Amino acid sequence: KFPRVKNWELGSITYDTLCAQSQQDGPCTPRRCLGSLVLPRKPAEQLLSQARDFINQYYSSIKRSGSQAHEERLQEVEAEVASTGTYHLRESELVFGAKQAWRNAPRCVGRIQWGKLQVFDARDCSSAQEMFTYICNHIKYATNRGNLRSAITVFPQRAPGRGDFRIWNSQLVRYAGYRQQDGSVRGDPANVEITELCIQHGWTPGNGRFDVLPLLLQAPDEAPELFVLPPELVLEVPLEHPTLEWFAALGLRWYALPAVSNMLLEIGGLEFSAAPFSGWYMSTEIGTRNLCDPHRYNILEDVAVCMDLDTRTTSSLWKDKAAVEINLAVLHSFQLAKVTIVDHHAATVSFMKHLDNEQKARGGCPADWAWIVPPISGSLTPVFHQEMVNYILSPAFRYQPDPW
Amino acid sequence: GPKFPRVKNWELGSITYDTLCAQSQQDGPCTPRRCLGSLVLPRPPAEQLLSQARDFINQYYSSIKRSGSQAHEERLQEVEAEVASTGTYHLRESELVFGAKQAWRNAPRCVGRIQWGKLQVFDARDCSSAQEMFTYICNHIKYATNRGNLRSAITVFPQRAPGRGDFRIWNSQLVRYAGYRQQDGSVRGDPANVEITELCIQHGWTPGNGRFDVLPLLLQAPDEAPELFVLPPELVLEVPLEHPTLEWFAALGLRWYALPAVSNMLLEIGGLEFSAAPFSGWYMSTEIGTRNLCDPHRYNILEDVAVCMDLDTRTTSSLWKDKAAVEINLAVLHSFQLAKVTIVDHHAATVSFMKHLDNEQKARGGCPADWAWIVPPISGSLTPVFHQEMVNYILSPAFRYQPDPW
Ligand code: HEM
Ligand code: HEM
Ligand SMILES: CN(C)c1ccc(CCNCc2ccc3ccc(N)nc3c2)cc1
Ligand SMILES: CN(C)c1ccc(CCNCc2ccc3ccc(N)nc3c2)cc1
Numbered sequence A: 001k002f003p004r005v006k007n008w009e010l011g012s013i014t015y016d017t018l019c020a021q022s023q024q025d026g027p028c029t030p031r032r033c034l035g036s037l038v039l040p041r042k043p044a045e046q047l048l049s050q051a052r053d054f055i056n057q058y059y060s061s062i063k064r065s066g067s068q069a070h071e072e073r074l075q076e077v078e079a080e081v082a083s084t085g086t087y088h089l090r091e092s093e094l095v096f097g098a099k100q101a102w103r104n105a106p107r108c109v110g111r112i113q114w115g116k117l118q119v120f121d122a123r124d125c126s127s128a129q130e131m132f133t134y135i136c137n138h139i140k141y142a143t144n145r146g147n148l149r150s151a152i153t154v155f156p157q158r159a160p161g162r163g164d165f166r167i168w169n170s171q172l173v174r175y176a177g178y179r180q181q182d183g184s185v186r187g188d189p190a191n192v193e194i195t196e197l198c199i200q201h202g203w204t205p206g207n208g209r210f211d212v213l214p215l216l217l218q219a220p221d222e223a224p225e226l227f228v229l230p231p232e233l234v235l236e237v238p239l240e241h242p243t244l245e246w247f248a249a250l251g252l253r254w255y256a257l258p259a260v261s262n263m264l265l266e267i268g269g270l271e272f273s274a275a276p277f278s279g280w281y282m283s284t285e286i287g288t289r290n291l292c293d294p295h296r297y298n299i300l301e302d303v304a305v306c307m308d309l310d311t312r313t314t315s316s317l318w319k320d321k322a323a324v325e326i327n328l329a330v331l332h333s334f335q336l337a338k339v340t341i342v343d344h345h346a347a348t349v350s351f352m353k354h355l356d357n358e359q360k361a362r363g364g365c366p367a368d369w370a371w372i373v374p375p376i377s378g379s380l381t382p383v384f385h386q387e388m389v390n391y392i393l394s395p396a397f398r399y400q401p402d403p404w
Numbered sequence B: 001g002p003k004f005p006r007v008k009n010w011e012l013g014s015i016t017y018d019t020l021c022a023q024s025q026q027d028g029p030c031t032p033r034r035c036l037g038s039l040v041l042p043r044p045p046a047e048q049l050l051s052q053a054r055d056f057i058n059q060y061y062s063s064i065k066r067s068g069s070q071a072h073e074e075r076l077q078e079v080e081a082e083v084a085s086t087g088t089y090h091l092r093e094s095e096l097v098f099g100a101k102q103a104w105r106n107a108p109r110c111v112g113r114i115q116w117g118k119l120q121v122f123d124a125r126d127c128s129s130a131q132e133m134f135t136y137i138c139n140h141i142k143y144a145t146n147r148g149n150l151r152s153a154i155t156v157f158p159q160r161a162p163g164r165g166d167f168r169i170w171n172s173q174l175v176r177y178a179g180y181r182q183q184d185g186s187v188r189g190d191p192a193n194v195e196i197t198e199l200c201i202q203h204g205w206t207p208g209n210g211r212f213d214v215l216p217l218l219l220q221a222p223d224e225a226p227e228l229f230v231l232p233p234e235l236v237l238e239v240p241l242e243h244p245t246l247e248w249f250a251a252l253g254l255r256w257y258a259l260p261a262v263s264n265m266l267l268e269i270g271g272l273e274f275s276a277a278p279f280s281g282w283y284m285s286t287e288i289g290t291r292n293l294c295d296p297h298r299y300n301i302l303e304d305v306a307v308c309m310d311l312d313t314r315t316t317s318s319l320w321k322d323k324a325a326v327e328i329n330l331a332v333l334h335s336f337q338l339a340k341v342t343i344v345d346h347h348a349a350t351v352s353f354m355k356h357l358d359n360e361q362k363a364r365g366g367c368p369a370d371w372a373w374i375v376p377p378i379s380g381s382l383t384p385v386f387h388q389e390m391v392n393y394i395l396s397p398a399f400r401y402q403p404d405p406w
């Protein structure tokens, strides 16, 4: 009926009743579970039902359901859809919707923070140059000299028969990846394609491992435009290690602000194709995935060798040892620079508290176990031992096709 | 594209389609509305038995390339006739062997499946007493332990029968350390084993008071109270744990047993149910070093080891837990190697599982796999399986969980 959900460390049991509010299919069926897949495989009455549902969520949130304002607002939406095939959100509704989308994101371990989100309304944007201005302001605000503040900037919604506003870059801060003819890649291999798009739109490339990319910003049915971010806007942290003096000589660094810019924001059936958002990093994102993934910077062996570890055999656990010191260096360096960051133990502990808040508030919480459990030391964190139910609620952040 | 799940490896960029999943006749816990993949346990008529039986016989004859043959059709008739007159049927020896291997091959939670074709199947379907089960189990342990050069094996006891009680081994594993509840509410020994420990005592076992007291076996023959059997200590190979450079680690007095021999799972083949069919392989080091030793609800030694390592246990950001865990895993690997007892680290194991996935893609068009269980509990993304999408589904023959007999 409703899923019984158990924590195996504590022996405690909840029932998820929130999942009954899901109106959107995931990829699983009784025959086979597809939960480990990264991406999904692929009229007015439909929009109207999503709109009413959202306005209802909204007025319930301010505890004014059935108010005159509530009924009038539903009529406004009804009237606008019926006449125009679409409608528009009020700023306060947009603010609520943006927070709910974050709250509903099953892959986010940082949702304890969901109610604290600065929302910049950029729906009065008419050009790539204007998008750039809004993005620079977003970055300045969120960066805040290292005392990071979560924020989202929302550009004009999609409209029928008109191209979307898009930011082509997957994040506002990305390091170039330059594909050598010698097969290899210099920089971040995750960004080979975006790096190449930039160059062919007139960017003069560098030749470094950590060259900050320009943004490709696209206003509707126009070719994207190139904008270089003012270097003083992009806060970066040089990596060093608290005891291993040689670590700094590796010339490693990372940027402060994780600002994701290729996701679609869906609120009440309306779609916001450019709505970049940022919070702060969990250390494993950088220390484990970005720096140690074999298809990213892949620095494990280098660090292992500097640590004089036995690289010849798996059973020396040289990979594990190097990874741990790498994560420590990331934590140490961010802490030294006074840049906000959270370790994977602290983050998962807060998420457990979040699950409990959400159980009392909504009778459940959608969560993606494979993404909530950190990429090192999994079972050493409480979320490993916690069963989770994954489902899609709306407002939602969604993936969308690359615009090229 | 193909109308089957597309499966991607994000490390290598490679793509496969799973067509094997089409062979699942048993639903799992998920629906289009919500994924329940992270759940540990989610929740005969002759007609029903017969189709499971026909399916298995079909699988058997395919595996020997005689599908459609005279011997194939005769075996079908024979099974149909046997169910027709008795309500059940019986497996030929070679069918049992094939089925036991296929159940292992089909287990989505097992990372060790590269080994699936190497399984010694001991037929114990003649067993008629609890004493005899014990003899069979001791023989299994001796064969499988092989003085440290471990060999995978399963011993199969008589199947469930109409109007007759089950053969059951009450213990979850052939080797289990006692868990003694203390007055302060804490547990001495392995907290995982509190219930079986107390059952052993209720059934007459004189309890020790150590952290590593090996439990006796509670063995149950049909329609009888279970009987208590003490394993001769020389049959139970254990490994004292030391660390290659941290000299104090040996002084901790930790140890683990060599043989992971699981004994409470039901082996289902062709509709037949083998309620007692203990099987054993060898350990992956993380099972001992990470879960059994560092789970908060297991031995929970993380903080103790971190203090010995002089780490800052007052703050999460020192990564004291991660550091201690790595050294404990290393100690397990070092100690087993020193003792010449078969063991596999989580890198070697996952690498071989990636090879297994490729073998099965070509052999069967897919491989059912539970990502949450396949990815090791430390260093997740440092292993190749983390970056491999997987499809999970139930195939038969199968190992299944079954209710505790009490
Ligand atoms: C405030 C500190 C935050 C922390 C520590 C945090 C943590 C994380 C982590 C570790 C992930 C996994 C990402 C990956 O492995 O690629 C993630 C994903 C995600 N986060 Fe959060 N987050 C924070 C703030 C936010 C904010 C402000 C938003 C949006 C308003 C957000 C929305 C999301 C979404 C939609 C995902 C899934 C994205 C995907 O599927 O790629 N998070 N978060
Ligand atoms: C040969 C070396 C083997 C290795 C290294 C290995 C490794 C593993 C590991 C690490 C697990 C996860 C267990 C847990 O976390 O509790 C597992 C599960 C499992 N293994 Fe294997 N295994 C091996 C042999 C076998 C054999 C011989 C069988 C049966 C004939 C088998 C059947 C299973 C089954 C059914 C599970 C699921 C356990 C459950 O759901 O409780 N394995 N294996
Ligand atoms: C298709 N590919 C290559 C691909 C798809 C999804 C991903 C996941 C990206 N997730 C990035 C992301 C998103 C939101 C975040 C919020 C906070 C935070 N600290 N990190 C965050 C990180 C990566 C690669
Ligand atoms: C309901 N409870 C308490 C519970 C449920 C499932 C489990 C999973 C136990 N799986 C153990 C297991 C099974 C088969 C194995 C085969 C080989 C190997 N090395 N380890 C192996 C380990 C444990 C407890």
Ligand SMILES: C[C@H](O)[C@H](O)[C@H]1CNc2nc(N)[nH]c(=O)c2N1
Pocket: A035, A036, A037, A038, A370, A371, A372, B010, B386, B387, B388, B389, B390
């Ligand atoms: C195949 C697998 O689903 C994929 O590698 C996932 C696993 N869990 C993850 N978890 C997080 N936080 N981020 C990720 O990118 C991934 N990748």
Ligand SMILES: C[C@H](O)[C@H](O)[C@H]1CNc2nc(N)[nH]c(=O)c2N1
Pocket: A008, A384, A385, A386, A387, A388, B038, B039, B040, B372, B373, B374
């Ligand atoms: C809640 C979660 O399903 C549970 O802790 C699982 C996760 N993955 C696992 N993976 C393995 N190999 N063994 C386990 O016991 C578990 N436990």
Ligand SMILES: [Zn+2]
Pocket: A028, A032, A033, A034, A035, B030, B034, B035, B036, B037
């Ligand atoms: Zn699922």
